[PDB]
Design a protein around this nucleic acid. Structure first.
Lengths: 197, 189, 171, 135
RNA sequence: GGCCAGCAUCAGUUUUGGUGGCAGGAUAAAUCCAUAGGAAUGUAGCUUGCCUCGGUAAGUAUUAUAGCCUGUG
RNA sequence: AGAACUGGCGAUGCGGGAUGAACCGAACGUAGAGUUAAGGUGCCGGAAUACACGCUCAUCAGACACCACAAAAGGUGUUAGUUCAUCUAGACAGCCGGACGGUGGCCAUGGAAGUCGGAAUCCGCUAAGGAGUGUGUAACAACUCACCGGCCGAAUGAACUA
RNA sequence: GCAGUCAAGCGUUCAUAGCGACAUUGCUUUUUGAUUCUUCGAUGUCGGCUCUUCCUAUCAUACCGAAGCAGAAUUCGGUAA
RNA sequence: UUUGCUCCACACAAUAUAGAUGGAUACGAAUAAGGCGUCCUUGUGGCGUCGCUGAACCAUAGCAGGCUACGAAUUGCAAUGUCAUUUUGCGUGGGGAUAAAUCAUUUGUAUACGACUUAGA
């Protein structure tokens, strides 16, 4: 409903995100997907690795600069999955895939802006407990990514800079609840409680 | 078939306190202290006494339950190693060429090097894990004793030894040389 | 399907040499009173020299369950045609109704042996009156004093597509 | 030794006598009580006090309510209505925040526009006092 | 006075809902009421090592200081 | 390659099988509303990330007949099942104890008490202990266990089916 | 052309270390054949030279396992092109 | 030759929109486990409590929103009924800064031509 949506992608499944994204973005919603190195995927690591090494195998023989561009970053693996789900070869798929902005980690603009979660793709809800799942950062790194040890050095600064905000806010609102709980014993609230507020 | 409840139980001799929170075991004792991670298993834990603990799995279905008793043994081995401790007595064997073993402080931690493994010149070194103390028998000067609390460290180090002191490109039915474990026990009994 | 249990009474057509031809009863499980008759003539034509055109259906009534709010442990003798040869089986089912047991038979047979409704004949269905002649663990485990088990990993279904807090599986 | 801090989880668990709340059916929302257990995935129930029949049902169609009352295995409707009324389960239930929020939703939804305007007026009084106080 | 839209009253085709009356079936089965027996995933009661009001132990006990099943009406 | 009956393509578009002369559905005047076929409803893709009982996790999974392939033989990987059975007069798993004597039962005699080895077969003790299952000293010993018991207090092996 | 399954036997004793008959299941299209759909208003037709790439059913090289492997030397097999 | 150029301040005009007309409202991590409040022998602590949907939370009255510390009809029974935000120009007036590249010539660490590399008041 909001003009722009910010999707935390931790504990998510890739192809079950992308079928929601690829429709919500084709229907006119701007989406950004953030913390994509924390994505999750079905299947064991060796298996989902071979399913990439049998992709790197596929390159145009007479000149491989014409052929399938095997991207190694999670932000681009997800974009691959979505580009497949979208008719990117038209001005509708094109127009949609410019409504999307995918990142690794959470940059500042989407740092101080609320994040959400797609429940019909959370590994927690969907997958059986006991199944093996593979993490996209480990995968990308094993197929030739480079910037894993950076994202962890930045997102941690994000986290310690955010935890202090949360503590500030909590140690502000614990008194708002007290001074509005100290004000709920009047007719103004005994009457609202009958209306359902 | 999917069962309903398969539960094992873990006795606890005194002096021990077993702290769990989010499937992270921590055990203490006279000998020392230890920890373990079991996030990769679905399993519960309850405290009916300070004298024992009850571990449980629910429907499972013949795969979770085989890890149930496994976990039970792992925790039990852990308690055993932080109450008594583990002792692995390896021994040397050879025909002509002795094996000259010693401990050495390299740039980092301790190592244990062996020379004259069948006349070889390759001084083959082995790291010592952190949880291990280490010595030589004295009643007979042709053994070695690894020791500690964690069996999965002690035994892994002993195997790390006897896997590198293994002859290659020769008849093993004849070249029964190297070092090998001989006794597994404790350092209290 | 939404099986209903029928009571089918049929009869060879009455000729002068025997105008009281002896009647034959079958207790059939079917989705309706059209295929009930079909299965009657199917199983009868397997035992007695009679067809539809050489017979008539006297009665098709329904048998509604008497104590459908009483949990029971049925035992089910059955034969089934595999891809290579027939076999007989015995399976025990815990349910309230003699026909719900059959619904959950055809399914756990179509899964465990990939047998269709056409490759299955229900020989005998009957309660085990006492909880000591059961022979199967997948029933006997629910026959325990003071049963109680949890549902560990709960999943709350979303109506909307976006949520603003991580969901929680606790029950 | 020192007391062993051991804690895993304290589930509400399907048992005989447990109370449940039905989410998806003809008798949606209406409370009931489990009687006995058919298998892992389904049970039977009887809520007589609220007008629920004696059903056999799965556990997706319901929710497990924490509260619980004592009864024997396989009990009947009269017996269940006996025990329900003894324990005063609807009183233990309406006390809770769960039913309070449920009723609150059901009441917010049933508001005329007049009520929805009265609310806007009234909240412009409470917040005035609260913003005066948090100063 | 002509074109374009809106509403109503109607007509044809069709879609989607709320509600009532009736008939049948084992003149539904059931639940419920009554009643005759039976047993345990054995309730009280009584034996039973100590003890939380017999909590445990396991014998007895067939509704009793819970209940259930079956049959008939 | 060649015949029989029918239906089709040819001469035929249309919705479906991604695509396809023949398959499934169905046969065409131009248009509008409604309903369906066959096929399908995660997204591309219009339509349930619907409900229900289960099976499967594959270091070449598998996924719309025609159709674009796959076998014999195997697997305690798992699920369900069939037929035997042993057995609370305590089997089977697991440790603890004994396993002795008549007697080296005769010969191969360079040496075999059981045993590098060939003919040959029974008593005493008992809970039970092979005139011998293994290790092997020129031979003797000493060990092993099938034969029995203590804990044990549960049930269990064997074959087969799909 | 290649491989597999039973395994009667060879194998000083020892089916299967290695091989392995009588039978039997398949794979391949680098053979030869059968067929005749395309091409007869033309697809330049043997071999070699040159040059690149691919396949594995690996001759060698790397790490391993198994032998009737003492060593040495050999054979069988595996991951691997 | 402040004809020129560059800003910001407002006055109009002009061109375009992959599409807002209340608010994109911020902890982290686990899920066979956690959030919040308190006490504290500050611990993987004791107690209580919440979830079981954001159906929330916040804002929300006034000429399409006014005068003073009253006016609002007659868009005549509906006909977006005009506000969003980039890019361009015109002039008005208050400032601010005063250049390089290419051709041609040339060198050869370069070169098929272009290109590259160098030098030149």
């Amino acid at each position: 409903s909001q003009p722009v949506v910010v999707i935390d992608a931790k504990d998510h499944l890739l192809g079950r995100l992308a079928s929601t994204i690829a429709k919500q973005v084709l229907n006119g919603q701007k989406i950004v997907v953030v913390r994509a190195e924390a994505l999750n995927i079905s299947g064991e690591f060796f298996r989902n690795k071979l399913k990439y090494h049998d992709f790197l195998r596929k390159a145009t023989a007479f000149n491989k600069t014409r052929g399938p561009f095997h991207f190694r970053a999670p932000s681009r693996i997800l974009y691959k999955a979505i580009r497949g789900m979208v008719s990117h070869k038209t001005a509708r798929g094109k127009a949609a895939l410019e409504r999307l902005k995918i990142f690794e980690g959470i940059p500042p603009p989407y740092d101080k802006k609320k994040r959400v979660v797609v429940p019909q793709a959370l590994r927690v809800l969907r997958l059986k407990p006991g199944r093996k799942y593979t993490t996209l950062g480990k995968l990308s790194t094993s197929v030739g990514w480079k910037y894993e040890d950076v994202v962890a050095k930045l997102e941690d600064k994000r986290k310690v800079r955010s935890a202090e905000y949360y503590a500030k806010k909590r140690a502000f609102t614990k008194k708002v609840s007290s001074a509005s709980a100290a004000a709920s014993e009047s007719d103004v609230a005994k009457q609202l409680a009958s209306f359902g507020y | 078939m999917k069962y309903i409840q398969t539960e094992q139980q873990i006795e606890v001799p005194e002096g021990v306190t077993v702290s769990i929170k989010s499937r992270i075991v921590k055990v203490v004792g006279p000998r020392g202290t230890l920890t373990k991670n079991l996030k990769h298993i679905d399993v519960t834990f309850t405290k009916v006494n300070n004298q024992l603990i009850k571990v449980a799995v629910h429907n499972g279905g013949r795969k979770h339950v085989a890890a149930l008793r496994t976990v039970k043994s792992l925790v039990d081995n852990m308690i055993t190693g932080v109450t008594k401790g583990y002792k692995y007595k390896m021994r040397y064997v050879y025909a002509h060429f002795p094996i000259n073993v010693n401990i050495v402080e390299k740039d980092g931690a301790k190592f244990i090097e062996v020379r004259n493994f069948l006349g070889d010149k390759k001084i083959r070194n082995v790291p010592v894990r952190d949880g291990v103390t280490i010595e030589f028998s004295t009643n007979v000067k042709d053994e070695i004793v690894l020791s500690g609390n964690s069996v999965e460290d002690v035994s892994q180090n002993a195997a790390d030894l006897q896997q590198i002191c293994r002859v290659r490109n020769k008849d093993i039915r004849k070249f029964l040389d190297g070092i090998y474990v001989s006794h597994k026990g404790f350092i209290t009994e | 399907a939404h099986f209903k249990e029928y009571q089918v009474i049929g009869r060879r057509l009455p000729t002068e040499s025997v105008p009281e031809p002896k009647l034959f009863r079958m207790r059939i499980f079917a989705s309706n009173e059209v295929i009930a008759k079909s299965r009657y003539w199917y199983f009868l034509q397997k035992l007695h020299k009679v067809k539809k055109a050489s017979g008539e259906i006297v009665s098709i009534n329904q048998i509604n369950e008497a104590h459908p709010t009483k949990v029971k442990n049925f035992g089910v003798w059955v034969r089934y045609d595999s891809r290579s040869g027939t076999h007989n089986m015995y399976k025990e089912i815990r349910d309230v109704s003699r026909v719900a047991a059959v619904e959950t038979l055809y399914q756990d047979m179509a899964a465990r042996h990939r047998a269709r409704f056409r490759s299955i004949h229900i020989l005998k269905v009957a309660e085990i009156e006492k909880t000591a002649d059961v022979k199967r663990q997948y029933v006997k485990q629910f026959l325990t004093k003071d049963l109680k088990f949890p549902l560990p990993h709960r999943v709350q279904k979303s109506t909307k597509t976006f949520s603003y807090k991580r969901p929680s599986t606790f029950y | 030794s020192t007391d062993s801090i051991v804690k895993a989880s304290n589930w509400r668990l399907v048992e005989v006598g447990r109370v449940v709340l039905i989410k998806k059916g003809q008798s949606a929302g209406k409370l009931a009580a489990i009687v006995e257990i058919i298998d892992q995935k389904k049970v039977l129930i009887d809520g007589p006090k609220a007008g629920v029949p004696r059903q056999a049902i799965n556990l997706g169609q319901v929710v497990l309510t924490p509260l619980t009352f004592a009864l024997p295995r396989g009990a009947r409707t009269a017996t269940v209505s006996k025990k329900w009324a003894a324990a005063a389960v609807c009183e233990k239930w309406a006390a809770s925040s769960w039913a309070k929020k449920i009723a609150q939703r059901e009441r917010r939804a049933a508001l005329t526009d007049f009520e929805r305007f009265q609310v806007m007026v009234l909240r412009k009084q409470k917040r005035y006092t609260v913003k005066k106080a948090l100063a």
